[PDB]
Design an enzyme around this catalytic site. Structure first.
Site, mmCIF file in Angstrom:
data_model
loop_
_atom_site.group_PDB
_atom_site.id
_atom_site.type_symbol
_atom_site.label_atom_id
_atom_site.label_comp_id
_atom_site.label_asym_id
_atom_site.label_seq_id
_atom_site.Cartn_x
_atom_site.Cartn_y
_atom_site.Cartn_z
ATOM 1 N N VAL A 184 55.108 30.996 36.415
ATOM 2 C CA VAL A 184 53.832 32.153 37.007
ATOM 3 C C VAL A 184 54.101 33.494 37.429
ATOM 4 O O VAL A 184 53.107 33.437 37.308
ATOM 5 C CB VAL A 184 53.811 31.179 38.717
ATOM 6 C CG1 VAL A 184 52.418 31.284 39.513
ATOM 7 C CG2 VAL A 184 53.258 29.917 38.438
ATOM 8 N N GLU A 203 47.998 38.239 36.517
ATOM 9 C CA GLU A 203 46.761 38.107 37.621
ATOM 10 C C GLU A 203 45.539 38.957 37.690
ATOM 11 O O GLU A 203 44.558 37.844 37.712
ATOM 12 C CB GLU A 203 47.535 38.421 38.925
ATOM 13 C CG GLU A 203 48.519 36.744 39.285
ATOM 14 C CD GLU A 203 49.826 37.000 39.065
ATOM 15 O OE1 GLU A 203 50.210 38.800 39.190
ATOM 16 O OE2 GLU A 203 50.902 37.080 38.882
ATOM 17 N N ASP A 209 16.964 33.744 8.798
ATOM 18 C CA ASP A 209 17.808 33.697 9.106
ATOM 19 C C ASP A 209 19.366 33.061 10.254
ATOM 20 O O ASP A 209 20.386 33.536 10.040
ATOM 21 C CB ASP A 209 18.278 35.678 9.828
ATOM 22 C CG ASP A 209 17.712 36.260 8.354
ATOM 23 O OD1 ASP A 209 18.125 35.920 7.338
ATOM 24 O OD2 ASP A 209 16.869 37.486 8.588
ATOM 25 N N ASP A 250 19.534 40.564 5.553
ATOM 26 C CA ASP A 250 18.236 40.135 5.158
ATOM 27 C C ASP A 250 18.388 41.962 4.625
ATOM 28 O O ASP A 250 18.582 42.867 4.944
ATOM 29 C CB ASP A 250 17.716 39.930 6.461
ATOM 30 C CG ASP A 250 16.425 39.461 5.832
ATOM 31 O OD1 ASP A 250 16.073 38.571 5.564
ATOM 32 O OD2 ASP A 250 15.764 40.789 5.889
ATOM 33 N N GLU A 289 58.476 42.757 38.341
ATOM 34 C CA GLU A 289 58.369 41.911 39.399
ATOM 35 C C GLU A 289 59.481 41.231 38.953
ATOM 36 O O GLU A 289 59.782 40.390 40.291
ATOM 37 C CB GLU A 289 57.306 41.898 39.939
ATOM 38 C CG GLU A 289 55.601 41.746 38.438
ATOM 39 C CD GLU A 289 54.825 41.980 38.787
ATOM 40 O OE1 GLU A 289 54.069 42.723 39.969
ATOM 41 O OE2 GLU A 289 54.161 40.986 38.071
HETATM 42 C C1 LIG Z 1 58.428 36.505 40.940
HETATM 43 C C2 LIG Z 1 58.558 36.263 42.200
HETATM 44 N N1 LIG Z 1 57.892 34.957 42.909
HETATM 45 C C3 LIG Z 1 58.037 35.006 43.806
HETATM 46 C C4 LIG Z 1 57.562 33.709 44.967
HETATM 47 O O1 LIG Z 1 56.713 32.494 44.357
HETATM 48 C C5 LIG Z 1 56.481 31.639 45.502
HETATM 49 C C6 LIG Z 1 55.867 31.843 46.354
HETATM 50 C C7 LIG Z 1 53.876 32.037 45.191
HETATM 51 O O2 LIG Z 1 53.940 31.222 44.579
HETATM 52 C C8 LIG Z 1 55.181 30.257 43.820
HETATM 53 C C9 LIG Z 1 55.010 29.139 42.749
HETATM 54 C C10 LIG Z 1 55.812 28.822 41.965
HETATM 55 F F1 LIG Z 1 55.935 27.731 41.133
HETATM 56 C C11 LIG Z 1 56.872 28.480 42.921
HETATM 57 C C12 LIG Z 1 57.670 29.274 43.991
HETATM 58 F F2 LIG Z 1 58.513 30.010 43.903
HETATM 59 C C13 LIG Z 1 56.202 30.311 44.264
HETATM 60 C C14 LIG Z 1 57.418 34.482 46.671
HETATM 61 C C15 LIG Z 1 58.157 35.200 46.668
HETATM 62 C C16 LIG Z 1 58.555 35.569 48.617
HETATM 63 O O3 LIG Z 1 57.726 36.122 48.595
HETATM 64 N N2 LIG Z 1 59.639 35.228 49.017
HETATM 65 C C17 LIG Z 1 59.569 35.357 50.480
HETATM 66 C C18 LIG Z 1 60.363 33.930 48.002
HETATM 67 C C19 LIG Z 1 58.463 36.898 46.263
HETATM 68 C C20 LIG Z 1 58.178 36.808 44.697
HETATM 69 N N3 LIG Z 1 58.874 36.782 43.464
HETATM 70 MG MG LIG Z 2 13.038 38.645 6.940
HETATM 71 RB RB LIG Z 3 53.081 37.958 37.457
#
Ligand SMILES: Cc1nc2c(O[C@H]3CCOc4cc(F)cc(F)c43)cc(C(=O)N(C)C)cc2[nH]1
Ligand SMILES: [Mg+2]
Ligand SMILES: [Rb+]
Ligand SMILES: *[C@@H]1O[C@H](CO)[C@@H](O)[C@H](O)[C@H]1NC(C)=O
Ligand SMILES: *[C@@H]1O[C@H](CO)[C@@H](O)[C@H](O)[C@H]1NC(C)=O
Ligand SMILES: *[C@@H]1O[C@H](CO)[C@@H](O)[C@H](O)[C@H]1NC(C)=O
Ligand SMILES: [Rb+]
Ligand SMILES: [Rb+]
Lengths: 987, 260
Positions: free
Chosen positions: A292, A297, A684, A339, A749
């Site tokens: 994810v 996003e 057309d 055409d 990130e």
């Molecule tokens: C690259 C990245 N992802 C992060 C994260 O993902 C969580 C919550 C949001 O979505 C999903 C979805 C999922 F499928 C699995 C998951 F584990 C999560 C949380 C945090 C954070 O704020 N923490 C306090 C840990 C920081 C992150 N950095």
């Molecule tokens: Mg014509």
């Molecule tokens: Rb992302």
């Protein structure tokens, strides 16, 4: 199957079948009953468009499935986490929520944009009901065309639109305008006698959308509504299904790329997560976190606002687009199937040439009159002009002084209309002028005399005599002439002149033009005194031995800006093909003159003309141009057609049916090209729908062509098409820039997270902040790359090879992720460990320390200086790690944009501040970055805190490093075009 | 897809790319840990005021929750053992690397005067709690239902709590005024005070054998078989006990249930 037999029936058989009469028509009773039975005589519009389903359509696509899948993954991960009692699962809901949010906010943005397209195009179409001279119960009255029912008896005059599919019963001098069904620009004659067994080629059927040019006819309606030829061709057109746009394919290609990387990274880190003594549940929660994180996003929003800005640019040039994807399509286009009548040509009989003073003069055939006129100084010219002006009954309708002459409506016959507009542009106030030469005798065009004639009294009272002025088919005028106006004298019309007239007649004939001869005689004031009683029956005036004035010849001439638009498309490497329903001769005429067929290119027929050998003997490889008519095209196969297509580059399709236009667009498309169809009439809509992009004319265009079209040229300016290529080639190139930019920040990130997994150091970059990055701080600088202008002569480049040249490729994608994102993550960690150490924690302490870090049951955790921290304290220190890694991101991102302004050229060559909007976006970037840090209350609402200005400067070395790195990538690729440095480091 | 002799050149490039970049990172931490001093924190921005912990620390959910049966020693042996193993490092035998301190006021050590460039740290041994030391009551007043909770403040290098009177601990309930007397708490050492010659902390490298001062708040008045909540606030001039985003700085709150 009703109609294939209607025109072959005897009149008794028709009035049997339809329970009507050929002389007195339906009764009112049965006509009303049939109207209830069959419904209104008009075409059923696209019905299935529920207002909520239009919006639901906007929530699918490459990025939308990606984002939806990713929304869903957040929720099953959230379930798992709350299951194992994980806290702050708020972040999962926040993220999945905003994923859905951008999808729907962009969905309704695009919905507004398409709704506004449909309103603009519906603001240009006429809503007054067409009418119909019907005859019922033996009464001739007028009704709305849509109240016609099958079997009804109707009438037509000059200028009436054909109200149904009529079977001709009686007709006098009746010729009609079939340019929306067939390509035919020449008026087609209508007669009651069955000319053919195919209702398409028979002369005794009048087609539902067409326009009676001249004469008069009366007949029976044999199909109304969707059962007419119109209705069938348009139901076919909506039967063809339009394929997926190039841009949509490319976005769906890189979601395949992003997904591939995503599940690869999630997977390898899932096994690496298990081998660190992690629960299978939690190990797979990290797997999902990763796949994810790979989802950008905000990119969907940026792509749309990029596309709507170019929609705005094109719309300002009177070129409307229905969907935003169709903005780019012109740029990727490789072939244009066009055409002829009504798109390329004006579909308007215009005076093209005159023969007088022993010379073929060529007039101006443009609509804004940007061309070059002819020599209007000669006495004989003035004589000819008087002839053609006085010998005409055509008349302009009232109140048209504002509108250009070529655009005025006229009450007149086919060739008389053209000649009226001619003297109105030549002489000025044509009908006022001819009122000054009162008309004592008039003979209209008929088959007995075979010419048209009129005798007039002259303009001043000093001249008492009369002038007779006559016009007709050139030979039939020449047989009645004895002298000829040449160079200010009236010479005797000897055999040398007879031969010369004939050679000029045939010359103008071979260009596919309708030519008329004109002539005059001055009746003596002695023989014909004022008040003299001219009688037509007893020929008391002379009908022979007249003086020949000249020849005038008309054609259907190209639209003013078309020939040069074709030239500018061909320089950009677009293959132009003509698909016209008109006969071959006039087709190749236009094709040659507008640029489809170059000067000095010839077909096998034209070769065998000068090589004087049978056409079969001349080599096909040697002929550059080729004309294929519909009959020959049907006898060929796919294999014969493709060879025929890629043997002759300048190709012309005459006498082609709507299905055949579809066919040729399809053969091109299966040969891998991106075809664009340009069209006006309902022949057309099939080809227009099947095409990658259908361009209809906004004025000449039919409702089916306009409905099947993805783009509309409201002003009918065919040069808007060349504006589309450059704009569409631009934002593609700008998208490669912009998409690359927004993808590169994804790696820095994700890495703090997955080291926060493996090395278990306190969390460097928190979810809620990477949201602020993706959706708030970097959207403005991304869409600013909408405005970078070309780095090449974008319009002398070839169309991009859709297999090699892609929006993102493994080189571009892998370069941008793993080199530049790597450098940004390294700046992150550097600011990370610095903010730790300066605040208490040493790099080697941060390893392994996450468990006690996040632990709410310790409140005396000891840093490397031995101090004791409560939970809320090291929570704030983690927020500081957030903000420090966040500004570590943004500084490299101020550098990333400037890198992405250019893909081949140095930033010094083109400058740093060329793009005004890009700098105003960078200043916007930095000041909201500061707003989030130093505004009061930000540590609590969000996870952002006022950082000390020491740590802002820590990543600037890294951002300068990337500026240098890609400048050296671009300097080494530009100065060294060798393939090693190019392929491995280029995008 | 790429040629195998290319593939190796590509990957040698990416390998060499990572090595150069990691190297930059290496020299950055190298420089970075030289930019900073081993005896004081550069900034200490989050440690404006110090936190205060409590023993025995047992939680359930939503903060400290402590319940036990005087009659069921199984419910309170674990708490007593928490206090024994915690004070195992305040025994005289383990805490012999310090000095008996009677400075009675701030112990500013301007210069480094102890073995191997160390520093002198005061001594604080268990017997200074006198009732809650583990002797003569190894249940620390739990058996009785007069539990000895020991309070201990967080340490910050070069931090001063005030100069007026010694920082004391005030333990009290919150919403139990109506029915029932106020609490009576006896503190050890008396008035629940911290000796001022324990400040300031010079850091785990300066003072390798440093040990925080403790006060035990033996709770006598607390009603049996009733849910109550006790807050121990710290009273000094440079201690802020009440801030909404950290309820452990300056105060401790815990739910107490002693049932019979
Ligand atoms: C690259 C990245 N992802 C992060 C994260 O993902 C969580 C919550 C949001 O979505 C999903 C979805 C999922 F499928 C699995 C998951 F584990 C999560 C949380 C945090 C954070 O704020 N923490 C306090 C840990 C920081 C992150 N950095
Ligand atoms: Mg014509
Ligand atoms: Rb992302
Ligand atoms: C504390 O100081 C007194 C005063 O001399 C001394 O008797 C005692 O031994 C000291 N404490 C220790 C543990 O040495
Ligand atoms: C502390 O111990 C002494 C001796 O046992 C005693 O006099 C005093 O009352 C005790 N204090 C409390 C609160 O039990
Ligand atoms: C305390 O323990 C005894 C024995 O276990 C038991 O009978 C009594 O009910 C307990 N008190 C409470 C309040 O549970
Ligand atoms: Rb001319
Ligand atoms: Rb289409």
């Amino acid at each position: 199957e009703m109609e294939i037999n209607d025109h072959q029936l005897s009149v008794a058989e028709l009035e049997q079948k339809y329970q009507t009469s050929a002389t007195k028509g339906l009764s009112a009773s049965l006509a009303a009953e049939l109207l209830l039975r069959d419904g209104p005589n008009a075409l059923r519009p696209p019905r299935g468009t529920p207002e909520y389903v239009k919006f639901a359509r906007q929530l699918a696509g490459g990025l939308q499935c990606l984002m939806w899948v990713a929304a869903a993954i957040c929720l099953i991960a959230f379930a798992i986490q709350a299951s194992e009692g994980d806290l702050t699962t708020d972040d999962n809901l926040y993220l999945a929520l905003a994923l859905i949010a951008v999808v729907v906010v962009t969905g309704c943005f695009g919905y507004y944009q398409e709704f506004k397209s449909t309103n603009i195009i519906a603001s240009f179409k006429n809503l007054v009901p067409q009418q119909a001279t019907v005859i019922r119960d033996g009464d001739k009255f007028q009704i709305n065309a849509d109240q016609l029912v099958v079997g009804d008896l109707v009438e037509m005059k000059g200028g009436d639109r054909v109200p149904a599919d009529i079977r001709i019963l009686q007709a006098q001098g009746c010729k009609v305008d079939n340019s929306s069904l067939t390509g035919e620009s020449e008026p087609q004659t209508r007669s009651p006698e069955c000319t053919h067994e195919s209702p398409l080629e028979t002369r005794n059927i009048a087609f539902f959308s067409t326009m009676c040019l001249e004469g008069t006819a009366q007949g029976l309606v044999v199909n109304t509504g969707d059962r007419t030829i119109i209705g069938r061709i348009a139901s076919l057109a909506s039967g063809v299904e339009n394929e997926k746009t190039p841009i949509a394919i490319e976005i769906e290609h890189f979601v395949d790329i992003i997904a591939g990387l995503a599940i690869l990274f999630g997977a390898t880190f899932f096994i690496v997560a298990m081998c660190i003594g992690y629960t299978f549940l939690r190990a797979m929660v990290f797997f999902m976190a990763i796949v994810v994180a790979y989802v950008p996003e905000g990119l969907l929003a940026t792509v749309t606002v990029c596309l709507s800005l170019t929609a705005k640019r094109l719309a300002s040039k009177n070129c409307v687009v229905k969907n935003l994807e169709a903005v780019e399509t012109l740029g990727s286009t490789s072939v244009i199937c066009s055409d002829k009548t009504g798109t390329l040509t004006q579909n308007r009989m215009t005076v093209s040439h005159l023969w007088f003073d022993n010379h073929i003069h060529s007039a101006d055939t443009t609509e804004d009159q940007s061309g070059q006129t002819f020599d209007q100084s000669s006495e004989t010219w003035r004589a000819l002009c008087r002839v053609l002006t006085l010998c005409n009954r055509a008349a302009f309708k009232s109140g048209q002084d504002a509108v250009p002459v070529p655009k005025r409506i006229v009450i007149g016959d086919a060739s008389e209309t053209a000649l009226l507009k001619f003297s109105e542009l030549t002489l000025g106030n044509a009908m006022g002028y001819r009122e000054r030469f009162p008309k004592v005798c008039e003979i209209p065009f008929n088959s007995t005399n075979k010419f048209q004639l009129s005798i007039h009294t002259l303009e001043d009272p000093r001249d008492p005599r009369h002038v007779l002025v006559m016009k007709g088919a050139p030979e039939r005028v020449l047989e009645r002439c004895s002298s000829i106006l040449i160079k200010g004298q009236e010479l005797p019309l000897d055999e040398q002149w007879r031969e010369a007239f004939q050679t000029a007649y045939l010359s103008l004939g071979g260009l596919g033009e309708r030519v008329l001869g004109f002539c005059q005689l001055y009746l003596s004031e002695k023989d014909y005194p004022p008040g003299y009683a001219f009688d037509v029956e007893a020929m008391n005036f002379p009908t022979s031995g007249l003086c020949f004035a000249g020849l005038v010849s008309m054609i259907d001439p190209p639209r003013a800006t078309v020939p040069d638009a074709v030239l500018k498309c061909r320089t950009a490497g677009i293959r132009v093909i003509m698909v016209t329903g008109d006969h071959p001769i006039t087709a190749k005429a236009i094709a040659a003159s507008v640029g489809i067929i170059s000067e000095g290119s010839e077909t096998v027929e034209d070769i065998a003309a000068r090589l004087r050998v049978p056409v079969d003997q001349v080599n096909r490889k040697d002929a550059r141009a080729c004309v294929i008519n519909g009959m020959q095209l049907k006898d060929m196969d796919p294999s014969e057609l493709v060879e025929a297509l890629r043997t002759h580059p300048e190709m012309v399709f005459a006498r082609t049916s709507p299905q055949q236009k579809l066919v040729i667009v399809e053969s091109c498309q299966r040969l891998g090209a991106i075809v664009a169809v340009t069209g006006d009439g309902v022949n057309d809509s099939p080809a227009l729908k099947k095409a990658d992009i259908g361009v209809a004319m906004g004025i000449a265009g039919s409702d089916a062509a306009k409905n099947a079209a993805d783009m509309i040229l409201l002003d009918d300016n065919f040069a808007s098409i060349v504006t589309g290529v450059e704009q569409g080639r631009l934002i593609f190139d700008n998208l490669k820039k912009s998409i690359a930019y927004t993808l590169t920040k994804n790696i820095p990130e994700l890495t703090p997270y997955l080291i926060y997994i493996t090395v278990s150091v306190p969390l460097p970059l928190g979810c809620i902040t990477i949201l602020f990055i993706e959706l708030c701080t970097d959207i403005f600088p991304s869409v600013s790359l909408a405005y970078e202008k070309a780095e090449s002569d974008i319009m002398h480049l070839r169309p991009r090879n859709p297999k090699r040249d892609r929006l993102v490729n493994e080189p571009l994608a892998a370069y941008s992720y793993f080199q530049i994102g790597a450098i940004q993550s390294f700046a992150g960690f550097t600011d990370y460990f610095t903010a730790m150490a300066q605040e208490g924690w040493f790099p080697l302490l941060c390893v392994g320390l996450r468990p006690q870090w996040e632990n709410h049951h310790l409140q005396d955790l000891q840093d490397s200086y031995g101090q004791e921290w409560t939970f809320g304290q090291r929570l704030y220190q983690q927020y500081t790690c957030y903000t420090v890694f966040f500004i570590s991101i943004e500084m490299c991102q101020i550098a990333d944009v400037l890198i992405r302004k250019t893909r081949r050229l140095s930033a010094f060559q083109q400058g740093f501040f060329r793009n005004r909007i890009l700098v105003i976006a960078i200043v916007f970037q930095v000041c909201i970055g500061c707003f989030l840090c130093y505004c009061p209350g930000m540590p609590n609402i969000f996870n952002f805190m006022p950082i000390r200005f020491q740590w802002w400067l820590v990543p600037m070395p890294f951002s300068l490093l990337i500026f240098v790195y890609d400048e050296i990538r671009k300097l080494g690729v530009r100065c060294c075009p060798g393939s090693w440095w190019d392929q491995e480091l280029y995008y | 897809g790429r040629t195998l002799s290319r593939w190796v050149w590509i990957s040698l490039y990416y390998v060499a790319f990572y090595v150069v970049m990691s190297g930059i990172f290496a020299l950055c931490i190298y420089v970075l840990m030289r930019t900073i001093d081993p005896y004081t924190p550069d900034y200490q921005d989050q440690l404006k005021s110090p936190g205060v912990t409590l023993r025995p620390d047992v939680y359930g959910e939503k903060g400290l929750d402590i319940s036990y049966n005087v009659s069921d020693s199984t419910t309170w042996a674990g708490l007593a053992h928490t206090l024994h193993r915690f004070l195992a490092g305040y025994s005289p035998a383990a805490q012999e690397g310090s000095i008996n301190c009677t400075s009675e006021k701030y112990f500013f050590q301007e210069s480094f005067l102890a073995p191997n460039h160390t520093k002198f740290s005061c001594k604080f041994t268990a017997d200074m709690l006198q009732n809650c030391s583990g002797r003569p009551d190894p249940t620390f007043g739990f058996a009785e239902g007069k539990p000895c909770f020991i309070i201990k403040m967080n340490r910050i290098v070069k931090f001063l709590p005030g100069n007026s009177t010694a920082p004391r601990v005030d333990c009290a309930f919150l919403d139990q005024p109506r029915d029932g007397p106020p609490l009576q708490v006896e503190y050890f050492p008396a008035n629940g005070t911290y000796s001022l010659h324990y400040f300031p902390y010079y850091g785990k490298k300066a003072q390798p054998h440093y040990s925080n001062p403790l006060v035990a708040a033996k709770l006598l008045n607390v009603p049996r078989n009733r849910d109550v909540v006790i807050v121990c606030k710290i009273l000094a001039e440079h201690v802020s006990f009440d801030n909404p985003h950290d309820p452990y700085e300056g105060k401790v709150e815990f739910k107490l249930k002693i049932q019979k």
